[PDB]
Amino acid sequence: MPNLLLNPDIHGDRIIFVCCDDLWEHDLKSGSTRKIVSNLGVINNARFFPDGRKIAIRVMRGSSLNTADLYFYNGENGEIKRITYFSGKSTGRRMFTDVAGFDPDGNLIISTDAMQPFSSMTCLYRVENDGINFVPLNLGPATHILFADGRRVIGRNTFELPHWKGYRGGTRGKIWIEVNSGAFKKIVDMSTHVSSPVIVGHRIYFITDIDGFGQIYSTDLDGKDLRKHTSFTDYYPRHLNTDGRRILFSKGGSIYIFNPDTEKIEKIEIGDLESPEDRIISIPSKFAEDFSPLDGDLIAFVSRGQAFIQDVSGTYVLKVPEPLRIRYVRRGGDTKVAFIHGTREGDFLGIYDYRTGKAEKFEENLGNVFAMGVDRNGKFAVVANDRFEIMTVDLETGKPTVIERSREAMITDFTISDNSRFIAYGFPLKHGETDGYVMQAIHVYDMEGRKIFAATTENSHDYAPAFDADSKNLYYLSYRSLDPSPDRVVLNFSFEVVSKPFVIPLIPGSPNPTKLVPRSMTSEAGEYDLNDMYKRSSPINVDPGDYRMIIPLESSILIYSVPVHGEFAAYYQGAPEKGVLLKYDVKTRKVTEVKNNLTDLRLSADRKTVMVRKDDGKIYTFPLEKPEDERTVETDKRPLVSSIHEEFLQMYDEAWKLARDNYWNEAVAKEISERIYEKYRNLVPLCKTRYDLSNVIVEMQGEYRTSHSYEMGGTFTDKDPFRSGRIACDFKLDGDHYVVAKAYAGDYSNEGEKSPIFEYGIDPTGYLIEDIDGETVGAGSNIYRVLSEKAGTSARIRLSGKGGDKRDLMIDILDDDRFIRYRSWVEANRRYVHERSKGTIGYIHIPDMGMMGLNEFYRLFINESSYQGLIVDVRFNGGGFVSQLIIEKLMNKRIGYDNPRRGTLSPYPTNSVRGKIIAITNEYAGSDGDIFSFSFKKLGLGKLIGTRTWGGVVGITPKRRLIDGTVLTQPEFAFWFRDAGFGVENYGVDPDVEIEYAPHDYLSGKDPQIDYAIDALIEELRN
Template sequence: MSDASGEERIQVFSGTAQPTLDADVGRVVALEAAPVGRRVALANHRNEVLLADLDSGTVRVIARSEFGRSEQLAWSPDGAWLAFPLWTGPRHSAIRLYEVATGKAVSATSGEFRDFYPAFDPEGRYLYLLSVRTFDPVYDNVHFELSFPRGVRPYLVALQAGGRPPFDPEPRGFSTKEEKDKPVADRPLRIDLEGLERRIAAFPVPEGRYRQIAGISGKALWTVFDVAGAHGRGGHAEKPGRLECFDFAATHCETLVEKVDWFALSRDGKTLVLREGKRMRALEAGKKHDDKGDAGYPEHSRKTGWLDLERIRVSVEPALEWRQMLHEVGRLQRDQFWVADMSGVDWQAVVRKYEPLLARVATRGELSDLIWEMHGELGTSHAYEAEGDHRKPPAVALGALAADFRFDPATGGNEIAHIAAGDSWEADTDSPLNAIGVEARVGERVLAVNGQPVSRERPVPALLVHQAGAKVELELAQANGEVRRTVLVTLLKDEVPARYRDWVERNRSWVHERSNGRVGYLHLPDMMSAGFAEFHRYFILECERDGLIVDVRYNRGGHVSQLLLEKLARRRIGYDFARWERPMPYPADSAFGPVVALTNEHAGSDGDIFSHCFKAMKIGPLIGKRTWGGVIGIWPRHR
């Protein structure tokens, strides 16, 4: 795709650049060239699937969804059929098969589940796909809840009726003579449409979090990832997945590569390109690579398969690049703003207004400022610009103690005025001064850091520059300066988690004290994974009190408000009784008494929505100030 003309157009390269296909194809999110003939399948931001004929120069829409995009496209080996997922509802999709010759489309799956990532067997027997149709719930360890953290399995659809069961291979001898069939691309692919949706079978592998699937001769490849925490606490941050290979002849699945984020096959199916983080690798498809055998070879070699991406050099003219970027910003808003009339703003006139200022832009930072100003003309929320090739400032990593100090003239040291009380069981969310063996107290003085004396001119924070995460030695003394001790602490890289926990716990204690323990308190910092975790951490404790305060002040927004409101709206209608225990509420995890919410002008986005819906659902009174007012949302997907 090229936007040299000012709009995105198909550009064909065959040794030298060929003329572009001047047709509106939208913002392309997927593109796949046919293996036979000069056709290209595309999917765009308008939820359309397009077929472009490069010979005739025509483009036609072959499918469109009202619910989402079709981001995976797959051609049959002979180029006669195109497979793609089509959203048929908010949460379910079907795999569609489009026949190029007739222009007719049929469903290969029922559309009652979420089916995605179609891929053809190169031998023309099967259509592979991934699907969410294994409903084996897992009980939650915190709340009375069940969920489906895995749910996906690889499947195949038999394209012809009457064949052998795919996972019951035909008995064969041990002959080493290879039997070569006629290449599928040289013969038409036959699909028996009658009963097609019923000829689906799951691969004999467990459900998981599968992301890609592809076919090579006699085998299927896929990636699978472990369940991971949304923000990586407890040692379960998302890790690279595994590339697995299922061999039909052996009916056996094995792991080919342990760490992979994404893969692609060459057109002939013989070479596999893998990505792990920012590294890429090319290996023989379908064979397990022995990394131990790479010892002694250069890192970037045919033996190891690792590609030397540092060899890539690109010539960049900043002024031309910045002009393209400004125009692309204009197109992105024009094509994807939430209403077609741009809220009454003449957007093209806005772009023309700001374009002449490009001549005065001298740095990447000034370009960002220009884009922000241009976005401001829309008068909307969530219109941002981020990332890019900004010149990085010097990295000054300040080590933190999550404590407040004041200078003590008597000793010349820094008196500890406050120590944040975080989660003592998590070293990176508590002040190092609280660590076992350190156990500093408010009122003690810090006299020296790593042997360097503390003074008015060089307070403790100044001596912690470039020490983030490092171990440092502190000399502490009691208020009279007589009893001194030296302790070793590991400085925090980020003190915000400790400070935040300290703030929440002080608020909670204040509410408990003022209400004689009758009112509970919890705070929601955002409506993302952190806010979801905070809610469930405290709700099971605080909901048993006579009343509950839900504090959404300073809420940074997100998308989980509906999940939290659903639980806050629960009403107790009964109790479960057991002989030796106190009555337990029904439904579980429901508030005992009234619930009120606190909000302010710094609660925004989904924090706005939570505040409004808390009132609309009549969960309880909403107290505070008018919220930020930014509910035109954001979906970052073009970088």
């Protein structure tokens, strides 16, 4: 049982590497292997210092490894020590805050976006006094820095890209070298991505797949004389590292050595190192899914692919006897439950009787199932799959029967009448193939006659169908009550409260039951007649709002309501959507609140019990008759038990099937998936930790050679994330004291855009920081670590000014200050533009195409769109989906003015840009950023300035997570431009004028890209 070895480094005969997230060292001379450091979190990079005495180490913490910092390991005394307290953000595809290289004097040079407004701005800093102080090199963003013959070699974006084989975009790794003490030239710029540069003698060795597979290459210090030294065909090589003589790298889980002298490649024999306990225990609540009420006050829930039946308190628990990946569980009878069991072949329906203990699985492959329900009488189930079909499956014969198939989207919103006769469901549809909007109408399936009837017209979005207990009326919701609500900042309007409930009596002539028409004044009788039932529809007298569920009861109607709210937290922090359960009394039309702070709600079969998940993340149950008697559902009394290797195998198969099933190009998907299956599946057995599995899965993902093949979330370590204390200030160690080199502030009047010290009436710039909470900081006291220990609280800080000014303040020590640094950066650019343009040009920055993007665009658009010219900066734009909404605003042409008796002219449109526009972009702008870039040119809004963009336009919409919570993304939506086709993918968008941002440009403190945009416009504005 061998391990997956990775990311090595070498020094003489000593080789260090990563195994089981820990650091190991192997002496080639003796052949002995020993673990030199563990239990620090997940280590992914280790680098010997020049003299090979000390070792710089990068480690990640946080369940998803989203934070990272650096440590030093002293092999002499076995001393471990943390060096950085930045808690740098990190993702598998961008594991920033790392070792960049070492300088002539042997000092460590780190790369980190810790104190920068953007994660792509990983600057170089020379560490001093083991972290006490960081001196910036000012060479701009870079991943590696080597020193050859007294001149610096800068590797930009040179980290590995296992998730994207064949990358050829604008963000590809390139190499630059100094030619004149402060003058740099780009020497290595190939069509493909260059990673892990190293220097042996006078040759730069690096890795690329320009020939169709990962191989080691090399060039002279001029980037000339390209040579290919390997011809690997099994697994891509990664992580080159050298001591100046021999080169070391990893490939397919094994460590290898490459001798530049002989060009010989030798595998190092290390053998079995560590095989931890396979049988693990996990907290069921941490991987909980599908909570549903059963009869007898019992509950069912799915966790980590296992399903359980238990009493509320979690004292009496029964695990459903079925192997891995039960996706859904639903009440099937008195003591029976129906469930969906997924395998590598697909999903299947099964039944389990927790009383007798009998379990039966049907062989019918239902495809990939995303919704499942069972009729109250337990005779059939209703299933929806990614084939866009809704079907019934006889719970006795297992025989399925497709009811209808949508060609637009899945039919996951359905309900079954209590008498099991009708099935109402939201049917997605479009009038034409290229419609921009998918409508949804409610269809009803009559089991008797097996015929489909339209309950609503196809003009809007109807949903949440629900039958009353007596199966006589069909209630549902629609977003049809159009009424616009005004935007409070921009001249705009949107539909915010247009949700309204409706009902359809199934028996013609029978009135809307909520209308209370006297029974003696209505001619009852009549048989079921589902024809033209949309013509009979009637709304219920409930104010429009934003409803998600309607539950008709004897004398009242429950309605799930979601208050109008901002999207920022959900979009970026996974914050849940908060709702409230409202009760509408039919008799008095009075509405009351039943429960608030909800995020989810399940209803009992008999409508007597309600299960809810609240914003606190806990599950509760309560009688719909007396919501006061609410009980908390407990699930962690009993531990979750599993086998690592069994789960690892199950996960790989699922990650592999998902990548195949959701790849945008079906044709290509079959070939690719079959070609890479075994190759990577074979490495799974070497995996012992979650990280190990990740290296394998990501490599197999990269085989699709398409953008957006990600790995997010999941649990990799039980280590709490690293902490960092910030006050939006930069520090410089001057002598024995720290001095506030810079204090950031964007718009002073906005919330969260300035050092918390400004609220005290002073600008801390040039002030000396004496001590924090009584602890002196400076020469022998790391201020970063101290802030780190105070993060999230207010500590007394003592400041000294140049004179007799001293301050004693209780300052809020933030956990982060990136947004502050960003808004400071933008506002700095804004002033600069106004200054250089002499008040004739305006400036707007767009950080991404999501909610942050909308915020910042308009935040400045309302003040900056009326200058003679306008600069739209989309550099570092992280993508999203609102580019089209911004373009729309930019496209507005000013064609008139309102002339008031008093006041000034009002331009028409109000949202029209007054003059000339120019846009700036770069290699860090991508996805929806690529689209904006391309669009800006295509629609002739103005010139595009900067460098080629990222080149990733194959979108994603993940809808399944692995049993451990991991969210993998598959490039499912390929964007196609008229005239350019799918050409943007894997290339990017070229600007009208390419303006490089060189290492010597950062050294001089000039932004040639913004300078050009400013000048180019001053020229255009002449006439």
